[PDB]
Design a protein around this ligand. Structure first.
Ligand SMILES: Nc1ncnc2c1ncn2[C@@H]1O[C@H](CSCC[C@H](N)C(=O)O)[C@@H](O)[C@H]1O
Length: 390
């Protein structure tokens, strides 16, 4: 019923499957409000696609269907969910992992919607008021497609007093313990934005232990809950974790504890990564593997970090405490920060330092985090293993 018209010469990407309706690409007189279903049409009134309104950035909403006759109802989501579920048969068949993503937004057909499986406890995240409107229809479909002990939610958009919490089912006591790569972690689906682990780094964590941990001093910067450290510690001589947040210490200790690792056999520091570079370098400390996985942006009073602008500083600091033979695991999650450009920054920085280097591995989102083949920013994870000689 409601219509948005494409600007001339902007049709083609949309005809070819581009899922994000860009504000700059369309105009409408139909008063598009969050929640609204609308059709995109060319200047010559050809139907292009059906989308829903959910603004983020320069974005109006997301394409949902190319079938004019398809109504956006429970049966609609039931179909996407079954397809999403079927594409994850591997995660149901593997030992050692009971937590993974079931539905990854636009990669699975609905931008702004994610569903995670934390050992039977589902976490649904909504990235706009727009997609929230469909909560009832979506929940009915969840009930029709998925098995679960409970359902939690989080609202991942501004100006909502309600933040999320328990939805239905049998509520557990948090933290609950999940398993991934035969490694145990605490999770809390009801406390602040983050759950205690980032599932998208499942395979990166595996590789770190498998290939870059044995008998090494492993440094983990911006450690959060110490997940990288926890898994690497079964192989490393010892790990060192560094995070600015007070909580990180006890949370990290506890994760070590779940895996039969004495926290006292590991090093855990609460401080700014950049301060740690100094302290480590002043005490002549060296590490064989340095994991760097910072937030895209962070602020500490006056002090700010931007992944875009400050990554060279991260690399130079690590190098000054990396062993002659050593590996850097350089990661980001910033969708705005494309792999090409990330690799460029890494290369430039390393070339400037005069060290010998080799990008040995480049990893992206795992399969449970299905990306969209016509939307490049969906591929937001970059993890680059770099072997160093200096
Ligand atoms: N300047 C800084 N120095 C060290 N840690 C920082 C920091 N600024 C933010 N952090 C921490 O970085 C974390 C962002 S989350 C990082 C997740 C982590 N890489 C993992 O593998 O799970 C937060 O815990 C935050 O406390």
């Amino acid at each position: 019923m409601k219509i948005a018209t494409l600007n001339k010469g902007k049709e083609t990407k949309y005809f070819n499957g581009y899922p994000l309706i860009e504000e700059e690409d369309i105009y409408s007189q139909d008063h598009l409000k969050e929640g609204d279903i609308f059709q995109i049409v060319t200047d010559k009134s050809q139907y292009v696609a059906t989308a829903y309104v959910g603004r983020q950035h320069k974005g109006l909403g997301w394409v949902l269907t190319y079938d004019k006759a398809q109504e956006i109802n429970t049966a609609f989501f039931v179909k996407l969910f079954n397809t999403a579920l079927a594409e994850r048969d591997y995660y149901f068949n593997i030992d050692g992992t009971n937590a993974f993503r079931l539905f990854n937004a636009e990669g699975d057909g609905v931008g702004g919607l994610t569903i995670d499986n934390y050992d039977g406890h589902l976490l649904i995240q909504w990235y706009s008021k727009g997609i929230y409107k469909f909560k009832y229809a979506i929940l009915e479909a969840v009930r029709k497609v998925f098995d679960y002990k409970s359902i939690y939610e989080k609202v991942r958009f501004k100006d909502s007093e309600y933040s999320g919490g328990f939805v239905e089912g049998d509520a557990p006591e948090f933290p609950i313990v999940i398993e991934e790569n035969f490694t145990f972690y605490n999770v809390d689906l009801e406390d602040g934005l983050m759950t205690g682990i980032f599932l998208d780094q499942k395979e990166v964590r595996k590789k770190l232990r498998g290939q870059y941990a044995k008998e090494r001093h492993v440094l983990n910067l911006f450690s959060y809950t110490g997940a990288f450290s926890v898994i690497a510690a079964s192989e490393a001589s010892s790990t060192t974790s560094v995070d600015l947040a007070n909580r990180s210490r006890s949370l990290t200790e506890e994760n070590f504890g779940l895996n039969a690792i004495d926290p006292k056999s590991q090093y855990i520091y609460v401080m700014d990564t950049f301060d740690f570079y100094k302290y480590a370098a002043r005490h002549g400390h060296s590490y064989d593997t340095i994991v760097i996985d910072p937030p895209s942006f962070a602020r500490n009073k006056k002090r700010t970090f931007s992944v875009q602008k400050d990554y060279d500083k991260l690399i130079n600091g690590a190098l000054n405490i990396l062993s002659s033979e050593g590996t850097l695991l350089l990661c980001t999650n910033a969708s705005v920060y494309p792999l090409k450009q990330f690799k460029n920054t890494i290369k430039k920085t390393l070339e400037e330092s005069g060290v010998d280097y080799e990008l040995t591995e480049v990893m992206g989102l795992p399969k449970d985090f299905k990306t969209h083949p016509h939307y490049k920013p969906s591929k937001y994870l970059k993890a680059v293993f770099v072997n160093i000689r200096h």
